[PDB]
């Protein structure tokens, strides 16, 4: 059975819900779950969601603690429901998919896991758990991650990193590299050859390739010179221009770190969630420059150079379709006179 | 085990917690417990207390549905805790005794029912349940009600009336009259001879003796002279005087009903609870007479006459103490020239 | 467009949302919508639902004010969604169907009005509005009510009464009699010859047939004798027995009125909603009799007699399926020695 | 000094704040003030306003309990602030004027009394309290009510009834008849000869003149014939027409009672407050007739006849200025062919 | 007297409640106390407790600002209530002991400071305040801290550090070293010779002895061999092993700092409170290693070596009771073949 006091017991001892037996007093006051440890109330959980507090507490305590794909990957892959587990979105601080089936009943609106309302539901399956590959096979539209490989199916190599307990990481002790399978209309797919966001951030930016180490360390103009990037105008699209109140270009996280190292400033995430492209409210604390909305995307700088290389320069103002995180991101690219005038993900 | 969804199950089927097994979805939103009946949320409970909503829901669903003594009887008898049941104060919409032991743990603050902090608590025992008489025997300070009689103990006859599911009543189908036992320091106290409030209501006042029928029907002065109450000032202490803005008298519910028959007015209960003497805020709609506070007692008119008779009138400004509902209520009785100037429950 | 201030404007002038233009200040504080009429906040709406307050306010202001089928009829007919209007459930004090499509986009979970997610949605169509018959024709599974009659479809006569603004009534000035059509899997249905609840209550019970007037007025035993009901034991199944704490029989609203007239008591609806059978918590204020759960059903007493007449008495303990309000209600009917021992809707 | 525990003390003993000394424990939980009477929390106050709960509790406990003018009178007279007391609006269940000066510093926004920000406020003065006449004299824009009469000022006779503790009444023991004075720009006014709403309701409608008693008792057509007002068409403007879904006319409370006496129906006040004209959502439970908005006004039927008598019939569709409750109410009157086609307060 | 506005005054000027005179406007909105500084509301306090907001505000403003023992010390010493002061638990953001006697009356469940209900309460006395030593003498069960020394009583040296305004510290300017006294059942105790937690953390770990500086600076293996720790397996019980997803050993804060210096990771305190042993949810951001629950204890590394030295190695799987912070903490210690297989505080 599922009870609030048992869930609170598990949380108090383990921090998540295993399924032990034992119960503890629980108090609920205004979107908050307290328990009386040693005669004093301590806050176990605080509902930041739009769900009822007991519902969200029971979803949170049941969250997945093994490494899992980042929620942006599942959004791009169209996942709607997770089978037999809960994916917690530590950005939103709430479950990734509002309904849950194969986990608990009153979270979902679908009648049955394969009912008519629940047919176009793209499920998610965790190969590391037994039987999930089978459930994939018998599924209508589903996405499967597997720790290793499965028979009779072409794999698809995903990102190096995964989210473990809300921190993204590349794991030695843990395999944060899964193989992906997709079956829409019961028919396996051919996942596109795609590009993976590195999922980094300014205050802890770490270069992951020699080009990145050169970018961070080398001076500006001699870096453009050194990697033969003179014709592609990285002084704006990457390096970031501050000569005006309206901050210009600067649509790569690498450039943001390369400037933030000089003088810190702030990023204002007005839509707290996860996506391949992230719109920030950017303000330069040194010069006073600020852009109302700035679309930042975080490729490998190696991969940024590769995609810019593979692109012809003939079209004056072209739109490119590049496959990032299994989704087609469209890049606006005005090329003037055979050089890169502007290049960023179109709003 | 103790489960919120089990409690809601019982409430949905039975309206109270029996102890069946089954669960129903539960949602908590802002001091309110809902459940999904046939796909729609219906509100099971709404917390009017100062307790956490799940705590109060569990206490409410565990309330006693057999006839029970009115809470004023238990307050006067000093009861502090009930054993193995919950008394619901439908006046306050909250349990009668905030702590609860012998039922559940985290409600009470005493460590153990026998522990030192819990020794000086007057417990309440329900004879109709088995074993409770024994528990009363082995109890330090306790009050016991029995439907019939117990061996080796002098009974004490209480009111004919009782609270069944929050409505007070006299029952032939159900025995609403109990025998009372009180033990202080394990020593069986002898209960005083006492008078009982009739717990009647203003809107639905019903005479319970011939004198009351005469009061309601007979004219005023013909009534005072008819029962020979001319020297006892019933025209003020009972009938109530409306000549002035400051309302006078009206300290018996009988007189309030006698006026309310002639014209409705409003009684405002600024302290919603249950007591032997109840202070009301009176506004007379016809005359406009109003008194900020007026103490009302609903003792039997027969027994009111009896107490007024048994009392000498020599003392000008005496204070009587009569035992009502097992507690000493003191009236102020100012007598002038062998008759009663004023007489009411002193504030 | 839809805005909170426009909706509040409409509510302030009309009481519901027509679609006028004009806006008024709005304040939201804790599940409550206020507006500043002449410099003072007046409460426009108070959210009793589990929906966000602005969502529920906009649903309520958009509710249907023409006469509509009672929500129990729509539940029985399986309706899941209403097209182009909102049905307010004044019992629950919340919308009858949580999602809305054909009305508003951010209340439903189905992607489109026509989608695989919304294939099994039994929609509701209001023939009194233009185009709704056509939408019914093109619909997958739908229920249509029509003011008069439609071509090519067998009608189905529904109840005499409808719900107008939350009060149920039979209308002279308004036609509260609709014809019903059901198309599951695209194919028209054959709505069963059914029995209709009269939707009455104790506070204002009014007889609707001569047998009912005899029941209310005539004495008990000579009424059983007069309509030749001696062999069917209406003293229990209808009249209601109070000889014990556990109240017996008494499963018809008419018997409830026939007793409540003698001495009033209370009914506790612990599941506030609408259904053909309603479980009450019943307590006899005179005798002190009380049943924890009592299933009450309100047929026409004429129709009760007819259904009991149609039943053979051979089966000792039979279960009868009778079609009430387009749904199969099953009575348990214990017949001993050719007479009606017990007969009530089985729990 | 003003403290929450002192205020709660006064409320617990008196029901309002006198200014005694003594304090009681107070708890605040979610717009509610509780106090611990004899070990149990009892709810003292529940905030229905948009003010902070302690602010509103301290305003409520300081409300005026002497008879006071109805809030609609003060609105019409333009009162913005009350000096040295609080007017509670029991309709809205909140103070009549949000700010208070001369009472409490942290409720108003004007810096000081008679300040430049405070100059254009019409204050209210209670003659029954000492010094208020003087404060009126020295005031810029003020309205004074006096129990009796004042020297050097023409009085103005107000309504017979006043609001005492939220119930309107004509008082014998209390003088609910005040004389009014208005001084705009420090210049005394000439209050118009006006007509007064009687402030009645359907549940307890009581005729106040012989014509009203005839209206209630007499049949319709012979009542029109009897008082000989056949040309003025009271079958619509007063009696109310019920032959259509859209209810017709029926803009006088007297007519509403004359129907509600026959068969009860429901009034839905969608703007809970006080005004000379009140817009109701009206529905006929018998016929099924219903009007979305109905402006009801409650004169003395004597005075209705008087205003209709003083009316010329030449203008086909005229707008009439009539002084009711010291404010100009406009009646629209389609009077075609010398007869009263339609006549009601224009929306 | 105690009032909300006076308390807010003190807080606004001083930050805590001294007892000055003066009052300031206060607003309460949803577990938050605001005051109007210069015409704008500023938030004074925000209720994180389970107490009523005014109750908690008055407790917080009355908190102790002199250095005080860590709440874990008082928990271990069994303290139930403080006398004449409030200990604030800055971990929980709530008072350390729910009930207060000598502070205010509506905080304690005990009827009196000295009563049968409050006999078994271990009170806390602050010797730095006058009369508290005397109150200790006359006390039933009490714990006293003294700044210096008292006559006729054996002292007991406590920890070097105290909590001043929620930050723990060893004080030069302030004496954070008290002498402890315990009188259970009126008889002075013999406080055990015990070990004291150092109360440090990863973000600001600072070594406090030469052995600790060697630990932080020296690499692993030469540190084990250098302090003769080869046979005691500090590579697991202290250094922490990351070869697997399930992190191993690592039950000393010093080892946590010694690793966190290399690569940072996170600690999730799922039970926010204070205790001698603290269960963390630990995840290695570099290797991906993570343990669901990890009991961390923070001795002086010198004292850890001392306890491991004093312990025999004969028992294969022993449990050691060592007195830390005046309480008996038991380590599980699996010794295999004369070496320390595992050693950590048993869960």
Numbering used by the authors:
A (entry chain E), B (entry chain D), C (entry chain F), D (entry chain B), E (entry chain C): -1 to 345
The authors write:
During our cryo-EM studies, we were able to elucidate multiple high-quality models of NendoUhex in different pHs and buffers, with resolution ranging from 2.5 to 3.5 Å. For more basic buffers, such as MOPS pH 7.0, HEPES pH 7.5 and Tris pH 8.5, the enzyme activity of both NendoUmon and NendoUhex was virtually negligible. Despite their similarities, models showed consistent differences in the switch region. For samples in HEPES at pH 7.5, we observed that the canonical form of interacting switch regions assumes a more closed and mobile conformation in comparison with known crystal structures.
The NSP15 endoribonuclease enzyme, known as NendoU, is highly conserved and plays a critical role in the ability of the virus to evade the immune system. NendoU is a three-domain 34 kDa protein that was demonstrated to form a barrel-shaped hexamer in solution by the assembly of two trimers. In terms of substrate specificity, NendoU of the coronaviruses is described to cleave a great variety of single- and double-stranded RNAs in an Mn2+-dependent reaction, by hydrolyzing the 3′ end of pyrimidines, with a strong preference for uracil, and to release 2′,3′-cyclic phosphate and 5′-hydroxyl ends as products.
